[PDB]
Design a protein around this ligand. Sequence first.
Ligand SMILES: *[C@@H]1O[C@H](CO)[C@@H](O)[C@H](O)[C@H]1NC(C)=O
Ligand SMILES: *[C@@H]1O[C@H](CO)[C@@H](O)[C@H](O)[C@H]1NC(C)=O
Ligand SMILES: *[C@@H]1O[C@H](CO)[C@@H](O)[C@H](O)[C@H]1NC(C)=O
Lengths: 49, 27
Amino acid sequence: VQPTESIVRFPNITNLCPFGEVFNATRFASVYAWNRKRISNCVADYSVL
Amino acid sequence: NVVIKVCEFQFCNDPFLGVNCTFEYVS
Ligand SMILES: *[C@@H]1O[C@H](CO)[C@@H](O)[C@H](O)[C@H]1NC(C)=O
Ligand SMILES: *[C@@H]1O[C@H](CO)[C@@H](O)[C@H](O)[C@H]1NC(C)=O
Ligand SMILES: *[C@@H]1O[C@H](CO)[C@@H](O)[C@H](O)[C@H]1NC(C)=O
């Protein structure tokens, strides 16, 4: 018997790793010194931008 | 909670809690 369709399950997308603040923050800094980023865990990225 | 951090820190000669972090977590 052949597979009638494919099925995929990965858990509830949860740690959207935060692009929100890096593109919402009122106080964007001047050229010289700005901000920075780090990674925790899970899947965030998406494609909102 | 359980609370966790990876912070590069200068601990004491006898570090305790009373009676620069690239990661952190809580449970
Ligand atoms: C900034 O916040 C607005 C909602 O107030 C949101 O629609 C927008 O996508 C945010 N920008 C980013 C990408 O952080
Ligand atoms: C106890 O853990 C919580 C985790 O949310 C934290 O908010 C709080 O500052 C911690 N307090 C101490 C004394 O470690
Ligand atoms: C904080 O961590 C960065 C990692 O590159 C290091 O350059 C800096 O000297 C550290 N500062 C302190 C006070 O731990």
